[PDB]
Amino acid sequence: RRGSFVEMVDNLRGKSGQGYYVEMTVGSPPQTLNILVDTGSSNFAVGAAPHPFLHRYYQRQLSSTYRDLRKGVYVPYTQGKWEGELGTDLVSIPHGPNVTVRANIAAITESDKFFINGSNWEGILGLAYAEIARPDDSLEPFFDSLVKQTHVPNLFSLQLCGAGFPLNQSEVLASVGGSMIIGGIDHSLYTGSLWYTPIRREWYYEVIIVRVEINGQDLKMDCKEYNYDKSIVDSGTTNLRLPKKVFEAAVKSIKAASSTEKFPDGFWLGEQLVCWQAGTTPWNIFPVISLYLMGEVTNQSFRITILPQQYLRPVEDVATSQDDCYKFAISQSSTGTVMGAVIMEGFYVVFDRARKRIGFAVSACHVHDEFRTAAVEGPFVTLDMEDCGYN
Ligand SMILES: NC1=N[C@@]2(c3cccs3)CN(c3ncccn3)C[C@H]2CS1
């Protein structure tokens, strides 16, 4: 396997809890900012005024190429909000395609619980489609601008690399967190074959899950439950989030598989860390989890399989110790399945917008042990898969 995108390999930093970010520049002369990669939204928005958690921000008055769109944007969401002022400017990705484009930028002037202290990022790059752009679908997303203005192919791919142990702010800064390959697929980043699932509709990166197993045991729910009210691939969410009913069934099964050790309710609620003596995390007592995805061929599916090394998220201990500690990174949702960063860390994920499909292959940087690895396997004969989609 040759790796043909060396300029873009290792261009990300960060971690599942705080997000993965890429360096970008905005304006003339270029202003460097670190930008969260978010496949779950569609706005390019950057800090544009002082904030306690920002060491730098976009200064529109210092950019000769700034254009004011004379329009505000207000983006409240469950956990937080940002608001700002729309404009356009020249934008580049230094460890990216060697192109500069004119793109929409939301200059964030006010926010609440958006910026994260010590995350090292100063804005967000929404890579999903115009339908979910704010204030409306007339605000062309960055990637749409990039493809229209250049010869960059209509595809990007993400290798998010979890360390398997905690990183502090300085360690994030010095460590490679993965790769965002703009316009292609780098074969060095994965092992085995790429398997593709259709993008059901171009808004979020929406997919259809057709079967779920815990250690090979079918969760045995009607497959519509798995996609109620949608299933998406979202680098801007930390956890694997499952619809309430599915979460309840999955947690019951995971508890049963891991029952040789009892964990407190707060662990299963994703709130409380668990710790083990250094090196002794009992990976083998925890089950693998397989999600079967609709394939491209009629009546065919494939599965992706993750380990506890994916769904147990490393965290630092609440007190000074050499223990290995984790939070359970599967949680309930009222807005559908979210395949967040902890599941993406298992895989190289190809966002093939041109062919309306998402590819999965085992990541060359997934965390595993000597006994088990993540997997992408197929095909399986699966009937009536369209019925798994929620309307
Ligand atoms: N993937 C996610 N991205 C957001 C993130 C905010 C901060 C980090 S990830 C931005 N967001 C959003 N929603 C609607 C329109 C625009 N953005 C929701 C929020 C949590 S989940």
Swiss-Prot record:
Its main location: membrane. GO terms for cellular component: axon; cell surface; dendrite; early endosome; endoplasmic reticulum lumen; endosome; endosome membrane; Golgi apparatus. GO terms for biological process: amyloid fibril formation; amyloid precursor protein catabolic process; amyloid-beta formation; amyloid-beta metabolic process; cellular response to amyloid-beta; cellular response to copper ion; cellular response to manganese ion; detection of mechanical stimulus involved in sensory perception of pain. Induction: Up-regulated by the Ca(2+)-regulated transcription factor NFATC4. It comes from the Eukaryota. Responsible for the proteolytic processing of the amyloid precursor protein (APP). Cleaves at the N-terminus of the A-beta peptide sequence, between residues 671 and 672 of APP, leads to the generation and extracellular release of beta-cleaved soluble APP, and a corresponding cell-associated C-terminal fragment which is later released by gamma-secretase. Cleaves CHL1. This is Beta-secretase 1. The modification N6-acetyllysine is found at residues 71, 220, 224, 230, 244-245, 252. Residues 20-361 form the Peptidase A1 domain. Expressed at high levels in the brain and pancreas. In the brain, expression is highest in the substantia nigra, locus coruleus and medulla oblongata. The active site is at residues 38, 234. Belongs to the peptidase A1 family. It comes from Homo sapiens (Human).
